Amino acid sequence: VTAITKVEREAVLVCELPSFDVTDVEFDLFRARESTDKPLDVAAAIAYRLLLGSGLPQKFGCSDEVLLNFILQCRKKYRNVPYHNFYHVVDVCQTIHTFLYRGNVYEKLTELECFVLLITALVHDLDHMGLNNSFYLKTESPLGILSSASGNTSVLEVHHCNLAVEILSDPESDVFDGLEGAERTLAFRSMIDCVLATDMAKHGSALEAFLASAADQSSDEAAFHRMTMEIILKAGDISNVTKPFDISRQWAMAVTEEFYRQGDMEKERGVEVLPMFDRSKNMELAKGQIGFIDFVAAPFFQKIVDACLQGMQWTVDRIKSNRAQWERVLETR
Amino acid sequence: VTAITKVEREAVLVCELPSFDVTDVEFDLFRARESTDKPLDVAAAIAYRLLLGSGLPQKFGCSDEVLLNFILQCRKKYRNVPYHNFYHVVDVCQTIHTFLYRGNVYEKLTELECFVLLITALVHDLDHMGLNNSFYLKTESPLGILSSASGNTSVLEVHHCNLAVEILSDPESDVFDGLEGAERTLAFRSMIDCVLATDMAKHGSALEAFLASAADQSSDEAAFHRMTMEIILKAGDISNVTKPFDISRQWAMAVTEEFYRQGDMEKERGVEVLPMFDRSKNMELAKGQIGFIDFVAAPFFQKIVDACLQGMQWTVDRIKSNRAQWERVLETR
Ligand SMILES: [Mg+2]
Ligand SMILES: [Mg+2]
Ligand SMILES: [Zn+2]
Ligand SMILES: [Zn+2]
């Protein structure tokens, strides 16, 4: 586990560019990436600022140096793919921060759980290659074969967890080293439960388990806390459609290109290419977004907001706002 | 010289190429070919639009009709082989157009030279029969014997030049008929020099001379211009790996099938059959593309971009992206 050098840390500590408020729901990561010729350092600085600003690391014995080392260890494990790169996870971290503190979801969780969520956002897609679980299973790729044999279909999610554990094995980057007993165990278990919950194949059950844990008041508080954590990481993971249109549009372009590259690799392997990943069809970007909004995002955010997270109402408003604009994109032309 | 008919020209003029931007570096010729049941006319229409859009034919006294007649006379001379057919030369023409105008290489040449380059792209592989120079020499075929006896082993290249001269000997299809004296001589000599430079046996020497000229501020201007033209036609000729992955992959498959057909004929004739031309060795495409990228394409484009053609940086970027994509294919196999 190649430890981080003081040089690597300095490159980050120098940033902290003005004109940006990382806690705002209107924060523009794309604008931030284009404000310097070292976007990876700015991205790292944003994550660093969000965590220290929450005041959480300090409270759990995690020094500023260990925090920065952890962030840099995570950064090194992300590939140069169109969407599932370091920027996506920094965005998820920033977004979760807004849900917790602008949406007041922090009231439903302990400080430790909020800390774990912000940390988990940074490890939730470690070493993603730009290919989804279905690709590994459809092509019988070695990792897919292992997943089938071992009994867990969440190919990537288990892989991300393995790497998160690897990073935390280094005392110099173990943001949970200041914890002991039940707290340290909860940090690891909750982190892992949340990453595993990002497999969209569990979307339905996760949402249902949350709504059930939220509805029934005779519900187990511990269960509600864990489910709220899982739902918040999930919400952050599919939050692209809840951002100002220009930002949402850029994220959509990025995910679409990555999907198209998977489709191209599938054509090379001679396997089935779903329309969503078929670059040939030259589909309208707007059509894919409206579809995701109608069948996935809109129902998800409306349900969790009405069931418990009232403070996140703006996500529902923005989704509807963006859907209308996507319609105009197709219309006006 | 069987003159082109009005009906033949009309079949091309009726193609409007909806949804295509022939000037874009991501233009998909395969998509254009699958857009109608008359791909040959679409291809001709693409070449026609590229030349007219350059605004060059008009400047040198070449009417729209003569230009179209020329394009059609060239088309009639290409055969139904897997790779070296009419689509390859139209692709080279389109690719060179992007190098000249998207890559700004036009700044290094006169308008006449840019005109000659676009025209030369269309004649550079005339009457190719799907067999390389080595095949003719190995088998001591009539064409190979003539090349040897006459002193020039660029078997096919000299042949393509002969057919180009034939087409231009009729005013009706002579895109250079509006030229006289020195300009006409330069047009023909430069066209011929460029075609002769496509022989890959001269790849290293051609690249070296260009780089030496580019690095020399006192290089003879005429010589530098000539070498720049030769380098640009060569660049267009080996530009497959500088295109979006799927397009690049489709070209690679055509190249392989043509090589396999030569290998089959070599076996029947009992001559040496390189592994690359052997169906039985079923070499993996990923390794084949990475090999060409590492030993030929990457260094060629990086060197010319660094030495003088800074505007073509995107070719280097795409080659890098495609290599990484083939590496992902290997990693997940
Ligand atoms: Mg994921
Ligand atoms: Mg040739
Ligand atoms: Zn994610
Ligand atoms: Zn060629």
XYZ file of C-alpha atoms in Angstrom, chain A residues 79-80 129 131 135 141-142 261 264-265 267-269, chain B residues 31 245-246 249 285 321 325-326 328-329 331-333:
26
model
C -9.729 5.271 -13.507
C -9.874 7.734 -16.375
C -13.829 0.300 -15.272
C -18.640 -1.430 -17.227
C -21.262 -6.804 -18.571
C -15.502 -12.204 -17.472
C -13.316 -13.613 -14.645
C -18.213 2.614 -24.622
C -18.817 -0.851 -28.113
C -16.939 -3.406 -26.018
C -20.096 -5.510 -29.826
C -16.446 -6.605 -29.800
C -17.282 -9.499 -27.454
C -23.192 4.734 -40.479
C -13.369 3.075 -31.111
C -16.278 1.410 -32.933
C -12.754 -1.563 -34.848
C -7.657 -8.216 -32.562
C -7.990 6.377 -25.625
C -10.006 0.546 -24.465
C -8.235 -2.445 -26.042
C -9.749 -3.067 -20.955
C -10.812 -5.730 -23.457
C -8.183 -7.092 -18.770
C -11.755 -8.416 -18.802
C -11.189 -11.400 -21.090
